[PDB]
Design a protein around this ligand. Structure first.
Ligand SMILES: C[C@@H]1CCC[C@H](C[C@H]2Cc3cc(O)cc(O)c3C(=O)O2)O1
Ligand SMILES: C[C@@H]1CCC[C@H](C[C@H]2Cc3cc(O)cc(O)c3C(=O)O2)O1
Ligand SMILES: N[C@@H](CCCC[NH3+])C(=O)O
Ligand SMILES: N[C@@H](CCCC[NH3+])C(=O)O
Ligand SMILES: [Cl-]
Ligand SMILES: [Cl-]
Ligand SMILES: [Cl-]
Ligand SMILES: [Cl-]
Lengths: 464, 475
């Protein structure tokens, strides 16, 4: 019925026309006495047709529906904090000294933010409403709202229109709150490490790089928090952690965003077994805390049930490939004879072999791949009984990695061999320690039934 | 006196020699039954409990002896210390010669001890080992500079105050997070890398994403995306996190620092003032049991000053106060030639450094920081009502032409909080951002904090480098 540019340009003209005649169409302050959630909670118990004309409230919110019986009766839907109530504006109840009813309400469109002074009640039908004496425009919406990629570029629209979108992001903040408290209860101490560093260690990933002008120095954005957090373990913070963005300069897809939110903790006097027990407590507890159960459903078409009831399976990556392929790969894995017997180095061959024959062994429970070779795991400690291997675990949910942990290599000698501030700190004595990383975005995806990482990040990185 | 390289090289030989004897000098796991704090709490109350056998761990920080059959150590874990009294008598001799075992244990070593709790005749709380295991040797000699910054792990082990500083830091951040959560604010993460870099007036860092072939700016503030969330209908939203400014480094500037911004739909400048006074007074009482704390502006060497955080705090209106102290009316527009020149002439008469290019915003900023930013040292205080030309995102004052509904709080001359009623008129004002304003931003109050700087005052530090674990430094 309406062109959008015309609409935009007319609402613009209206705003200036208000200005030019004195009205301030963007008032500074509307003193509100109740929120929409508070309103519902207080007045749901009313009878149908009941008005409390005695009781005057100031309320605010955004108009999302506009309707009318005729000129002297207008209806709107008013939303605040994910809740909605009806505004039933009736000519006769209008404080007419403050403005002509028809001109006051004809200028109120879908998307406008308003302030309303009026009395609570219900329609005969039973609809909970505010009945205004005065409705003030506090901030106009200049575009027509919708009744694609837009969810990502214009997230504010998504949050207003789709009830589920908001629910996804509340869950997100809850998940992060749960984790933070889970660790705080267990005596972990939260810290911030630097985002920009001269070296960029902690994982195997191409880094972003930037420049500081006044120091004339190039810097790498951190690809992980591992190295500085161990330094703090040396510094005597026995249980330490960090939740925060890390940056990897690799391609973007459903399960990759160039900046993502991770959590790493390090735990002095711990090892892989404790890390396994912690992982099983954390996930089972988190999921119960959100759903009242350990089985969640997910839409990997029809959904599947993921059962987070512990324990979980622990598949040993060498013993399992050897099992299913009926072939021995002797422990010098980067040797020519073993590299061949697989077949672009040994680390990437194992990654592909694992990524085919092992990472989707289970879909109906989360599970662990354990005991990765030293050649894949340069900071993980050597296995206490199994030459060539390490005390490492990675948890997987539906084929994607969400948790990576190991007993930390704390021998400065067995480490220079896998390759400075960090190297030196190891020489001051790192205690035996267990370390663990989490993919918070990825975990959020499963727990909010999303199948892109872009759905659980408010502003995912996109091209222009 | 021992050469440090010899020391390092000998402890190295010791480690290998352990390897070759079959010993694993970096064991995987010592099952401990109690932490040092737990130990102190349980045994504060000259007696031995030879019956109770504990496994404990920690770092040796002092080494001493009364001959061969009696060795003393200080063992530290989680900021606490107890004594290790190793006594030939109680030693399990099956496990090895007493003298050889304890001769090999040096300052800095991490150990695992199996033994019994007690107190010396003198009364020092101790563990009395039956067996001590080396878990991880310290290959260098610990100290009894800049090293605090490059080797923070050393700082944390040696200086009790350093650790305290960083516990206070995390506590401050916990308090704030709960302070807002209690009041219904919702925490979010916004992007660190953006196509535009608004939010404040600061040169940004720039970086590049390869697969998208795209340049990106590291965020200089969280303001713009957080208002977008206000439009999106999160009425009370916040973020605590790093921001990045590519400008110089000094006592009060680190290229990455931690801020907190919150935005609060339907609030304004007055609510922001009430909040600020509640937050600071409550934070300080929560840490110290009082509202007045002492601070070493001049330095530890010099006499401190008391800062009183009892509310209300002074509100100095920036135009009233400059015109007051300089005896001048500054006509508007402030960017007019006649006023710009008059500001140039005030700065000259008072013999002050004139700014980079002499723009009006930068001249007012200098006038303010010379005549106003140090009006008080004994309490925090507010500078309010800054001109629009200094405050491009702040809303226009509801009664005061030319001005804005802005406040900045100062402690000892440094800015730690900047807040205003948000300009939400897309006309009086990033394209994504500019466009969202066209969808309707409610009247909203917005507020920013410098966490590092607040930490400084609340832990008596004179540099921002003292409250950041790894400050950025030259190599
Ligand atoms: C620190 C956590 C510990 C668990 C494993 C996880 C893998 C990480 C990989 C990754 C790469 C990337 O370029 C963009 C991303 O978003 C992600 C992601 O989300 O998960 O890393
Ligand atoms: C966002 C908060 C709002 C309160 C005021 C505060 C000022 C900020 C200035 C600054 C610039 C810089 O380049 C490095 C820095 O560390 C700092 C700093 O610490 O404080 O900013
Ligand atoms: N830094 C690892 C996570 C921690 C593993 C245990 N140190 C990663 O980026 O995947
Ligand atoms: N973003 C501002 C904080 C102001 C808060 C009010 N919008 C800053 O960087 O200083
Ligand atoms: Cl433990
Ligand atoms: Cl991956
Ligand atoms: Cl409010
Ligand atoms: Cl006012």
């Amino acid at each position: 019925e309406v062109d959008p540019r015309l609409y935009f340009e007319n609402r613009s003209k209206f705003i200036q026309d208000q200005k030019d005649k004195g009205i301030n169409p963007y008032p500074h302050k509307f003193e509100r006495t109740i929120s929409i959630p508070e309103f519902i909670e207080k007045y749901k118990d009313l009878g149908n047709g009941e008005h409390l004309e005695d009781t005057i409230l100031n309320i605010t919110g955004r108009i999302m529906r506009v309707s009318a019986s005729g000129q002297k009766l207008r209806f709107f839907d008013l939303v605040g904090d994910g809740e909605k109530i009806q505004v039933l504006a009736n000519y006769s109840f209008h404080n007419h000294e403050k403005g002509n009813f028809a001109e006051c309400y004809d200028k109120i469109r879908r998307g406008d933010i308003v302030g309303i002074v009026g009395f609570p009640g219900k329609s005969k039908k039973g609809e909970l409403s505010i009945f205004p004496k005065e409705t003030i425009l506090l901030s106009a919406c200049l575009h027509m709202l919708p009744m694609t990629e837009i969810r990502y570029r214009q997230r504010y629209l998504d949050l207003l229109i789709n009830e589920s979108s908001r629910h996804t992001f509340v869950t997100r903040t809850k998940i992060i709150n749960f984790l933070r408290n889970f660790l705080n209860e267990r005596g972990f101490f939260e810290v911030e490490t630097p985002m920009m560093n001269l070296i960029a260690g902690g994982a195997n990933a191409r880094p972003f790089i930037t420049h500081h002008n006044d120091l004339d120095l190039d810097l790498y954005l951190r690809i992980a928090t591992e190295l500085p957090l161990k330094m703090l373990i040396v510094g005597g913070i026995d249980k330490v952690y960090e939740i925060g963005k890390v940056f990897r300069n690799e391609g973007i897809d459903n399960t990759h965003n160039p900046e993502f939110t991770s959590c790493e903790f390090y735990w002095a006097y711990a090892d892989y077994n404790d890390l396994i027990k912690w992982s099983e407590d954390f996930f089972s507890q988190l999921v119960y805390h959100l759903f009242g159960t350990y089985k969640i459903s997910y839409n990997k078409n029809q959904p599947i049930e993921i059962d987070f009831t512990p324990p979980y399976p622990k598949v040993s990556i060498v013993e399992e490939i050897e099992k299913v392929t009926n072939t021995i790969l002797e422990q010098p894995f980067d040797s020519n004879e073993t590299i061949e017997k697989m077949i672009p180095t040994a680390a990437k061959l194992l990654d592909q072999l694992a990524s085919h024959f092992i990472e989707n062994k289970y879909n109906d429970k989360p599970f662990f791949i354990v005991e990765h070779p030293q050649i894949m795991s340069p900071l993980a400690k050597y296995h206490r009984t199994k030459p060539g291997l390490t005390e490492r675990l990675e948890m997987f949910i539906c084929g994607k990695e969400v948790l990576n942990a190991y007993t930390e290599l704390n021998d400065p000698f067995k480490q220079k061999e896998c390759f400075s501030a960090f190297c030196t700190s190891l020489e001051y004595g790192l205690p035996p320690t267990g370390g663990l990383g989490l993919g918070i975005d990825r975990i959020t995806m499963f727990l909010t039934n999303k199948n892109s990482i872009k759905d659980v990040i408010l502003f995912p990185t996109m091209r222009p």
